[PDB]
């Protein structure tokens, strides 16, 4: 029924990830039946905080906290567990036994994005970095990438640029085009979030410059995936998962918990390393066609409770 | 085309820092197999830990003019001038387990920041993110190094993973040794629920002394590396050993001098030669009947292609 109400409380919206993210939550919200109401702060944490009150208020049977930063949110979170209400975080880490995160396994996104850039430079880069703190997933990927700085000295960090400002991926090109005169050594770029590569990438092809660099990135939708087959693209290879199946998991792990279902502490989405070439081989030019043709992508399996799965082949 | 050199002219020599335990053996036994396969003579010294015999071993093959060395585990510092000096002569470099800041020297690896990473995880998801560990392992080690980093990381992501003890040391008895120690940090921190050993002769002492004590249930144990003694003592009943990640140690060695054998042929190889670890629970080794090394490789043939030239794999035809 839609007695269920299920509210998905938002710090960021902005670019196709979080859209298909969005998209799919709606259609595994549809699926099940139930009632999913959206709110979306836009970078405010005091609006956020007030967004949550709301859904408090309006006793609904779970909030699911997309992204946010602990420190506002902890307390919203301990009343609206107290209360009855069920809770799961996407990107944001709670100190909870009662509330399951789901994440993209971001330690190992970012590993793997970041070796990838180091193996193919032969250990010897220099790197504009593009990332930002304050974002659970951007952190995550973060220290990984000092440990590939560490066990691999000859990549070189030259420059960190990046702010998360609704439109991203527009400011990170005019700072990228800032950046490589700044830095005319640099020869790579290593971006934690599709947006800020997007930016980056329209820097470089606008400038002339595809050649001089490789581009190495975190996400995949069909944007980033037209953008890296372009000829002479410098977008070499991107980490990330299907992020529409992660907005259904994540409504699908909320409906369990109503359903007094006990859910694992981590729900970990597995991320998979995509190359240009591995597109351009293959003829990939939308998700459609790379979820066919890298099937770990497409994968069922967390959080189908047998009375759920039943439930979604009713309607 | 066949290069000139190549063929029991052809003479790498095996210079290893450490050579205890099965890991090691199945190492040198994989080495053994390729060098029977080129037909190429293999030469062997192993420093036991002396770092001055080591030095003075790899000396000694330089002055033999042999036309490579494999440098296996040693720290960069005592062994850099050697290795410089080596490649000036013309003799090629490839190293397993030490760091390398030489474009010459191809550096294998197991992937270690992904072996450390992987069992660290397992750990902490296991756990449910709150454990009080018994961290065994030991500096001074390219690979255990590496693992250490994704340790770190894990305490950093998951705050109720807590260290609540560090032993280890590397001693030639060291299973024998890690089980002492083991018996007296059980005492000291009776809180500890899990140990972590980034070696498998670490976890084997862990083990035996979780055994002896009769707390198999109150332990669960992660390592790394994997042989057919793992395998046996994973698989016993009551078994506190739930987990380890890595590699076919046979297949490693075999790959070493394999590429030894490319680069004294001409051939320009990759910088880094990652062996691709494997994750392997005790659970997947009952659920399957796996009782040795070969069974699991069958079982999961994701520890089964680098470095095979066309000349090469078709020397290893002929021969
Ligand atoms: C601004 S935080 C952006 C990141 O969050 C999600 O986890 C996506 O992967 C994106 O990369
Ligand atoms: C003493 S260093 C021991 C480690 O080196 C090898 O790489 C094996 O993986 C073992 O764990």
């Given at each position: 029924?839609?007695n269920?109400?299920?509210?998905?409380?938002?710090?960021?919206?902005?670019?196709?990830?979080?859209?298909?993210?969005?998209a799919?939550?709606?259609?595994?919200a549809?699926?099940?039946?139930?009632?999913?109401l959206?709110?979306?702060?836009?970078?405010?944490?005091?609006?956020?905080?007030?967004?949550?009150?709301?859904?408090?208020?309006?006793?609904?049977?779970?909030?699911?906290?997309?992204?946010?930063?602990?420190?506002?949110?902890?307390?919203?979170?301990?009343?609206a567990?107290?209360?009855?209400?069920?809770?799961?975080?996407?990107?944001?880490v709670?100190?909870?036994?009662?509330?399951?995160?789901?994440?993209?396994?971001?330690?190992?996104?970012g590993?793997?994005?970041?070796?990838q850039?180091?193996?193919?430079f032969?250990?010897?880069?220099?790197?504009?970095?593009?990332?930002v703190?304050?974002?659970?997933?951007?952190?995550?990927?973060?220290?990984?990438?000092?440990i590939?700085?560490?066990?691999?000295?000859?990549?070189?960090?030259?420059?960190?640029?990046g702010?998360?400002?609704?439109?991203?991926?527009?400011?990170?090109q005019?700072?990228?085009?800032?950046?490589?005169?700044?830095?005319?050594?640099?020869?790579?770029?290593?971006?934690?979030?599709?947006?800020?590569?997007?930016?980056?990438?329209?820097?470089?092809?606008?400038?002339?410059?595809?050649?001089?660099?490789?581009?190495?990135?975190?996400?995949?939708?069909?944007?980033?995936?037209?953008?890296?087959?372009?000829?002479?693209?410098?977008?070499?290879?991107?980490?990330?998962?299907?992020?529409?199946?992660?907005?259904?998991?994540?409504?699908?792990?909320?409906?369990?918990?109503?359903?007094?279902?006990?859910?694992?502490?981590?729900?970990?989405?597995?991320?998979?390393?995509?190359?240009?070439?591995?597109?351009?081989?293959?003829?990939?030019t939308?998700?459609?066609?790379?979820?066919k043709?890298?099937?770990?992508?497409?994968?069922?399996?967390?959080?189908?409770?047998?009375?759920?799965?039943?439930?979604?082949?009713?309607?």
């Amino acid at each position: 029924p839609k007695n269920v109400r299920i509210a998905l409380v938002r710090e960021v919206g902005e670019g196709s990830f979080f859209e298909r993210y969005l998209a799919g939550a709606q259609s595994m919200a549809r699926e099940l039946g139930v009632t999913l109401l959206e709110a979306t702060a836009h970078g405010d944490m005091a609006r956020m905080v007030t967004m949550i009150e709301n859904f408090i208020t309006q006793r609904v049977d779970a909030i699911i906290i997309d992204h946010g930063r602990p420190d506002p949110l902890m307390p919203k979170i301990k009343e609206a567990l107290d209360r009855g209400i069920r809770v799961v975080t996407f990107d944001l880490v709670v100190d909870d036994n009662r509330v399951p995160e789901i994440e993209q396994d971001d330690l190992l996104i970012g590993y793997l994005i970041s070796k990838q850039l180091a193996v193919d430079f032969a250990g010897n880069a220099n790197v504009i970095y593009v990332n930002v703190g304050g974002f659970a997933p951007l952190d995550k990927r973060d220290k990984m990438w000092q440990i590939i700085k560490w066990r691999f000295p000859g990549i070189k960090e030259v420059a960190k640029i990046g702010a998360v400002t609704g439109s991203t991926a527009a400011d990170t090109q005019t700072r990228m085009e800032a950046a490589m005169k700044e830095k005319p050594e640099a020869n790579a770029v290593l971006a934690m979030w599709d947006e800020f590569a997007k930016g980056a990438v329209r820097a470089i092809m606008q400038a002339g410059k595809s050649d001089q660099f490789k581009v190495y990135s975190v996400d995949v939708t069909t944007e980033d995936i037209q953008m890296m087959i372009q000829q002479n693209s410098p977008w070499v290879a991107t980490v990330g998962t299907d992020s529409y199946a992660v907005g259904r998991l994540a409504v699908r792990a909320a409906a369990a918990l109503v359903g007094g279902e006990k859910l694992p502490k981590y729900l970990l989405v597995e991320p998979q390393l995509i190359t240009r070439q591995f597109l351009v081989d293959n003829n990939i030019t939308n998700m459609d066609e790379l979820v066919k043709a890298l099937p770990a992508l497409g994968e069922s399996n967390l959080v189908w409770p047998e009375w759920l799965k039943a439930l979604t082949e009713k309607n």
